[PDB]
Amino acid sequence: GSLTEDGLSYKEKFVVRSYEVGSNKTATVETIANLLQEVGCNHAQSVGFSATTTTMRKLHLIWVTARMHIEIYKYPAWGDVVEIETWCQSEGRIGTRRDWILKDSVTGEVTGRATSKWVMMNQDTRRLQKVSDDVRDEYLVFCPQEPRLAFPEENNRSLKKIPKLEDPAQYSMIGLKPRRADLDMNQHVNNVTYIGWVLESIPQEIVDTHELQVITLDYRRECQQDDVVDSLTTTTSNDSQFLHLLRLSGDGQEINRGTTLWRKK
């Protein structure tokens, strides 16, 4: 992996692994999301982070995901080389955005694109806050100044408001718990695990006859290591659309809400 010529974006190539593919012998959406996370981390390392800046570590502040949106046109086959380009952009005092473009290394064609919204949070109190001027100046030297968006369209799916699923759900997967492989180096549940949990309530027949085209996921609250989650899905629709909800099994506290779009194979 390496920063591009202008140093305002980062590229990395990955060879799709045998354990990373599903029944179609192509990468799962969770493998894609793990690769996006990996190239994001390698971008942050290449410009001097550890994604906390000097001022963020001084004030016990971190970046947390608020939303992840992914659109896949072609999932890379086992043994294929996929090239991912990533960049960051400041969105004023609201937060930051990380975008990705996925390409087939052999053809050079765009096979996927993703965008994520990040908010500032105090590590200890867990209180969200706006971005300060000092933090904005610190990361503007690593971001393109003119807008560069993976989803530029006028009324694009990445910015749509997602409603709350009403009980009873059409489908459900109950009692989901994270194991040690689901945790990151800081012992927090990996963001990709939540995508897997959302997909658990999609019926097997949809997975067997459809390919996932779009997934938009809102992150409201974290799942702790000893928490238990319920995954809920309701069909909202050639294409199939679903409305999703992750909540704690006990009190029913919302942790995530989302939507998926699937196309018939």
Ligand X SMILES: O=c1[nH]cnc2c1oc1ccccc12
Residues that bind a copy of itself (CB under 8 A): 17-19, 21-23, 25, 28, 30, 34, 37-38, 41-42, 45, 78-79, 175-177, 179-181, 183-187, 190, 192, 196-197, 199-200, 207
Q: How far is CA 212 from each of CA 77, 86, 144, 245, rounded to the nearest angstrom?
A: 15, 22, 31, 17
Indicate which single residue of 17, 57, 126, 177 sits in contact with ligand X (rule: CB under 6 A): 126
19 binds, among ligand X, a copy of itself, none (CB under 5 to 8 A by kind): a copy of itself
Nearer to a copy of itself, 33 or 150 (CB): 33
64 binds ligand X (CB under 6 A): yes
Name the residue among 54, 39, 12, 67 with its Cα closest to residue 139.
54
Nearer to ligand X, 177 or 220 (CB): 220
Say which amino acid occupies 53: T
* Positions marked active-site: 186, 188, 223
CB of 132 to a copy of itself, least distance (A): 27
3-state SS, the chain, equals CEECCCCCCEEEEEECCHHHECCCCEECHHHHHHHHHHHHHHHHHHCCCCCCCHHHHHCCEEEEEEEEEEEECCCCECCCEEEEEEEEEECCCCCEEEEEEEEECCCCCEEEEEEEEEEEEECCCCCEECCCHHHHHHHHCCCCCCCCCCCCCCCCHHHCCCCCCCCCCCEEEEEECCCHHHECCCCCECHHHHHHHHHHCCCHHHHHHEEEEEEEEEECCCCCCCCCEEEEEEECCCEEEEEEEEEECCCCCEEEEEEEEEEEC
41 binds, among ligand X, a copy of itself, none (CB under 5 to 8 A by kind): a copy of itself
Nearer to a copy of itself, 136 or 227 (CB): 227
CB of 9 to a copy of itself, least distance (A): 19
CB of 219 to ligand X, least distance (A): 7
12 binds, among ligand X, a copy of itself, none (CB under 5 to 8 A by kind): none
Nearer to a copy of itself, 138 or 200 (CB): 200
Contact letters (x/-) for ligand X, 182-211, by CB under 6 A?
----x-x-----------------------
CB of 64 to ligand X, least distance (A): 5
CB of 137 to a copy of itself, least distance (A): 27
Say which amino acid occupies 176: L
Q: Which residues bind ligand X (CB under 6 A)?
A: 62, 64, 123, 126, 186, 188, 222
